[PDB]
Amino acid sequence: RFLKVKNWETDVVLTDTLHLKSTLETGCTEHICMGSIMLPTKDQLFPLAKEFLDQYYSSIKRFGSKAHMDRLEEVNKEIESTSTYQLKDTELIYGAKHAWRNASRCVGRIQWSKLQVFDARDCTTAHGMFNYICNHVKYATNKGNLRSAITIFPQRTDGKHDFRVWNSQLIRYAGYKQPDGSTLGDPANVQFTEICIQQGWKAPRGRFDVLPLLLQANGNDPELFQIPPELVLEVPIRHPKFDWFKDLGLKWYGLPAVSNMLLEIGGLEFSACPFSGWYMGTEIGVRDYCDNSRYNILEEVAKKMDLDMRKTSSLWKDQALVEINIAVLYSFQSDKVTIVDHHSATESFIKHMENEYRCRGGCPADWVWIVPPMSGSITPVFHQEMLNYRLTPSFEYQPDPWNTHVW
Amino acid sequence: RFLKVKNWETDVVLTDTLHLKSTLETGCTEHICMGSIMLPVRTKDQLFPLAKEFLDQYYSSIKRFGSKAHMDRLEEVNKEIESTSTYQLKDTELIYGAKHAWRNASRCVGRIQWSKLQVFDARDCTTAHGMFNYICNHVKYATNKGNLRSAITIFPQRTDGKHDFRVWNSQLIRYAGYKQPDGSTLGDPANVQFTEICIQQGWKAPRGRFDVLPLLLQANGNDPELFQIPPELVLEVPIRHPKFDWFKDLGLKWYGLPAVSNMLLEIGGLEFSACPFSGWYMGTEIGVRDYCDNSRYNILEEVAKKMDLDMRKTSSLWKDQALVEINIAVLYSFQSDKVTIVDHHSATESFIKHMENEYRCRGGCPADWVWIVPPMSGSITPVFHQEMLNYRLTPSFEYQPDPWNTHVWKG
Ligand code: HEM
Ligand code: HEM
Ligand SMILES: Cc1cc(N)nc(COc2cncc(CNCCc3cccc(F)c3)c2)c1
Ligand SMILES: Cc1cc(N)nc(COc2cncc(CNCCc3cccc(F)c3)c2)c1
Ligand SMILES: C[C@H](O)[C@H](O)[C@H]1CNc2nc(N)[nH]c(=O)c2N1
Ligand SMILES: C[C@H](O)[C@H](O)[C@H]1CNc2nc(N)[nH]c(=O)c2N1
Ligand SMILES: [Zn+2]
Numbered sequence A: 001r002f003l004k005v006k007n008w009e010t011d012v013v014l015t016d017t018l019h020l021k022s023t024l025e026t027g028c029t030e031h032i033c034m035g036s037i038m039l040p041t042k043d044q045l046f047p048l049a050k051e052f053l054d055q056y057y058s059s060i061k062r063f064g065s066k067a068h069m070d071r072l073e074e075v076n077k078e079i080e081s082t083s084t085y086q087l088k089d090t091e092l093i094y095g096a097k098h099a100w101r102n103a104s105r106c107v108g109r110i111q112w113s114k115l116q117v118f119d120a121r122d123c124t125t126a127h128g129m130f131n132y133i134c135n136h137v138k139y140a141t142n143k144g145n146l147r148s149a150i151t152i153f154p155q156r157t158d159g160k161h162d163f164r165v166w167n168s169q170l171i172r173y174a175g176y177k178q179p180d181g182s183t184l185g186d187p188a189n190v191q192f193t194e195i196c197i198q199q200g201w202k203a204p205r206g207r208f209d210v211l212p213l214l215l216q217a218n219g220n221d222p223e224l225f226q227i228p229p230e231l232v233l234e235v236p237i238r239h240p241k242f243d244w245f246k247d248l249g250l251k252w253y254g255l256p257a258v259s260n261m262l263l264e265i266g267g268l269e270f271s272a273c274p275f276s277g278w279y280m281g282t283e284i285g286v287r288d289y290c291d292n293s294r295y296n297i298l299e300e301v302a303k304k305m306d307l308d309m310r311k312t313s314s315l316w317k318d319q320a321l322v323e324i325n326i327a328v329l330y331s332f333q334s335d336k337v338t339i340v341d342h343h344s345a346t347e348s349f350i351k352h353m354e355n356e357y358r359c360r361g362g363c364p365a366d367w368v369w370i371v372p373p374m375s376g377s378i379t380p381v382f383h384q385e386m387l388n389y390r391l392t393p394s395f396e397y398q399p400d401p402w403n404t405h406v407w
Numbered sequence B: 001r002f003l004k005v006k007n008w009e010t011d012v013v014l015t016d017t018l019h020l021k022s023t024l025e026t027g028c029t030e031h032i033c034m035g036s037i038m039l040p041v042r043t044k045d046q047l048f049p050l051a052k053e054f055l056d057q058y059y060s061s062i063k064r065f066g067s068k069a070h071m072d073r074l075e076e077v078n079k080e081i082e083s084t085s086t087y088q089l090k091d092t093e094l095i096y097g098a099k100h101a102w103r104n105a106s107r108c109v110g111r112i113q114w115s116k117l118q119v120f121d122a123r124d125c126t127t128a129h130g131m132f133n134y135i136c137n138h139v140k141y142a143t144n145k146g147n148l149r150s151a152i153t154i155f156p157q158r159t160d161g162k163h164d165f166r167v168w169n170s171q172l173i174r175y176a177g178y179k180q181p182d183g184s185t186l187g188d189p190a191n192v193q194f195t196e197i198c199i200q201q202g203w204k205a206p207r208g209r210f211d212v213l214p215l216l217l218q219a220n221g222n223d224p225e226l227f228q229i230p231p232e233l234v235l236e237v238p239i240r241h242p243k244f245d246w247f248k249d250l251g252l253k254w255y256g257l258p259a260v261s262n263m264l265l266e267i268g269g270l271e272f273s274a275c276p277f278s279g280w281y282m283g284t285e286i287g288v289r290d291y292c293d294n295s296r297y298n299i300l301e302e303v304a305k306k307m308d309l310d311m312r313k314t315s316s317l318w319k320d321q322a323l324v325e326i327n328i329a330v331l332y333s334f335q336s337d338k339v340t341i342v343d344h345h346s347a348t349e350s351f352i353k354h355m356e357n358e359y360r361c362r363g364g365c366p367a368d369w370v371w372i373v374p375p376m377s378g379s380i381t382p383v384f385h386q387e388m389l390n391y392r393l394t395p396s397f398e399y400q401p402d403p404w405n406t407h408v409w410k411g
Helices: A042-059 A066-082 A089-101 A126-144 A187-199 A281-290 A298-304 A316-334 A342-360 B044-061 B068-084 B091-103 B128-146 B189-200 B245-250 B283-292 B300-306 B318-336 B344-362
Strands: A003-006 A013-016 A116-119 A149-152 A175-177 A183-185 A213-216 A223-225 A234-236 A251-253 A262-265 A268-270 A394-396 B003-006 B013-016 B118-121 B151-154 B177-179 B185-187 B215-218 B225-227 B236-238 B253-255 B264-267 B270-272 B396-398
Touching: A013 A342, A042 A066, A042 A089, A089 A116, A089 A149, A089 A262, A089 A394, A116 A126, A126 A149, A126 A213, A126 A223, A175 A187, A183 A187, A187 A213, A234 A316, A281 A316, A298 A316, A316 B318, B013 B344, B044 B068, B044 B091, B091 B118, B091 B151, B091 B264, B091 B396, B118 B128, B128 B151, B128 B215, B128 B225, B177 B189, B185 B189, B189 B215, B236 B318, B245 B300, B283 B318, B300 B318
Parallel strands: A116 A149, B118 B151
Antiparallel strands: A003 A013, A175 A183, A213 A223, A234 A251, A262 A268, A262 A394, B003 B013, B177 B185, B215 B225, B236 B253, B264 B270, B264 B396
């Protein structure tokens, strides 16, 4: 019932008690581990509300105070009457900070308490959503000095009046299938791109076309908007050694901003809650550029380096991978756009885990996600046992809107 | 019940039914995943079911389930257990069992090879000198002058747990490590405590960076005894780089034969506590972990110095650069000396083909993603993108406590 994790490189052992406050299910059983699977009423709501307010009031050192007992009654009264309830600004901010704190797949959580929360619960239309988002984008970008932020749209009511951002991230590139058989731009977004087109978008059909926002307010049909080009900070990619690298025509955007997840706080569900931090270099250079089903540039890079691509055992893919990732980091750093390398980010996460264990009794972490997609064992997280479990407030995946939406 | 796994790069979806035959526990629950934790005498009562389940599996594999030989064999094992408290495997069952423990090993990327395993039956062994001889023959057979052949050698099974056969070494061939008074380590830091044991038992340590350790062998629960593997049987590869001529002057070498000697083989409820097995290396095992782990040889800095990489900031990726060059070197060296090795692209690609065929023909393939994905360049190998299901099938290989912690010293 009380659990130990060991770091096999430093011998530091930590004791986890926080998991006993775990709530949702993992997908694993005593018979089978699903650790590597990507996704394994009025009566329902009040326990969820109480559990949250209890942790909130405990966190400001006022557990069991009149103010605590008063709030619980007020929410109880509101749920019995209205069938839902409203969070105080203080609770909303705490809730959002803790959903990030509890994100077991996130390596950057040392930052969790520095989150700017934009309360957009007063929003009513897609134009309003567009405004809130441009404002979030400009605030977070901060001319390259990135600041973590979330913007929180109104909560689910009856589930037929959902606010949704249809985009998977606020800033992404279009993907197009061509007569060729090959894919131009990002193959991850082919389907979303087509949805844009079929909703009215004027696609320039290039390699790096910033997608428009498809924004759904109050369960209404989603509407298109172009983000002002001037708010999208992009970085041309060059290499500090290879003068040919720039002519691959590679660029990426400065702002990673997840926009398709669901924030659960105290039983309430926020289906539009785009949030953003800054990039770890491997996300672009390893995954975005080198995944076979993404930009898949390894072949083209290895050729310009004139490596022996004859046998996999020359490690040409691995050589090219490192150079691409050097170029990503160098480019962001030369243009003064915040970025972190996987060495620095994973070392910070170890420090963060030690703080969480000492201060809070644990830190849920999903090793499969935390260990970077290159050079795994040379980062400390590789040697770090982790325990994965679900705490709330949380961010959750949710069905893509187009499969759900009644037109 | 069916479970599906998807490969997110290819969209190939596979269906697992084999997990229904899983017995032992994972360590996980509905509330906690322990997927990244390294480690999360029997009675007649529990033994006959374990025997029955195994013999049912054996007899199914040979298409003789429910046959007269099948039924007679169950009755013969039943009686043997009721009379003696244990039972003996037929040679055919031992071979089947050992191959299946490997087939079932969810942390092994090399399992495409599982049906090609040379099983050496050492159950007639009685003494440490006997074990030594068996182990030399395994090494010489598996080494095959560099054309490596997989093999296992199986010493007598556990009886009352007071007469165990144990190989005290964690692998048959490993380099010594010596903690210096100044706190630095000479040789391999992983093997310090074991080296200390060997010296206490009387080993004369040459005290270099790559001293092959002696075998420390325990027969029949007796105190273990030391033996030196004949050096002519220990194939070694000096490590050099195809472009960098200073690489040789680092004085690196490694041995060709990876041979695990501290695991326990369970077959039909019987426990073989001494069962050294060997295959051949995937390059990253040496190049990434043995050479570049912080708690191991730790050569990243020295290599990076010699490459004249920018070392003042981690974001130059100097470690990542040096890591790739070292791994190029290991693969080049082995290939040049005609010693079997596999690179991590070839090995993971082969594993995915193995895994798909297993799903098709067997109904599943338990796999532990944490261990299967290579410790460098993870996502440019196809296994990173493959969902996997981890569960425990028997026959199996299992960890066991280090024998110095449990052994009752006779003197
Ligand atoms: C400040 C810098 C941040 C860094 C360096 C960072 C790092 C990362 C990385 C590398 C991943 C894996 C992404 C992937 O592989 O696709 C991730 C996942 C995640 N992060 Fe962060 N993060 C940051 C900020 C944030 C913020 C501000 C939030 C929420 C407020 C957040 C919530 C999450 C969530 C929910 C996931 C998992 C997403 C999923 O399962 O698809 N992160 N983090
Ligand atoms: C044919 C060549 C083989 C290759 C390339 C190979 C590859 C590997 C690698 C890379 C690992 C992880 C090792 C580590 O990180 O320490 C491993 C684990 C393992 N393999 Fe293999 N393997 C091979 C043959 C075998 C054989 C012959 C057996 C037994 C008959 C075996 C059984 C196991 C077991 C039980 C593990 C888990 C070890 C542990 O948890 O410490 N493998 N394999
Ligand atoms: C906020 C933030 C900061 C930072 N440095 N990086 C990020 C990266 O976020 C993402 C990037 N790319 C994709 C996603 C969404 N991932 C969903 C994975 C998935 C795919 C398919 C099925 C499934 F169940 C789960 C998030 C986010
Ligand atoms: C047969 C074979 C072939 C091949 N290519 N590679 C191997 C590698 O096998 C090992 C190498 N080094 C160490 C081990 C033993 N693993 C121990 C893992 C461990 C460490 C500490 C605690 C724990 F619970 C578990 C196996 C084995
Ligand atoms: C199948 C497997 O779970 C999948 O490829 C995971 C592995 N680890 C990951 N880790 C991160 N950070 N991001 C990912 O998208 C994935 N993908
Ligand atoms: C804590 C963590 O599980 C541990 O470092 C694991 C990670 N994956 C591994 N994978 C392999 N093949 N071998 C290892 O020793 C490890 N170590
Ligand atoms: Zn699990």
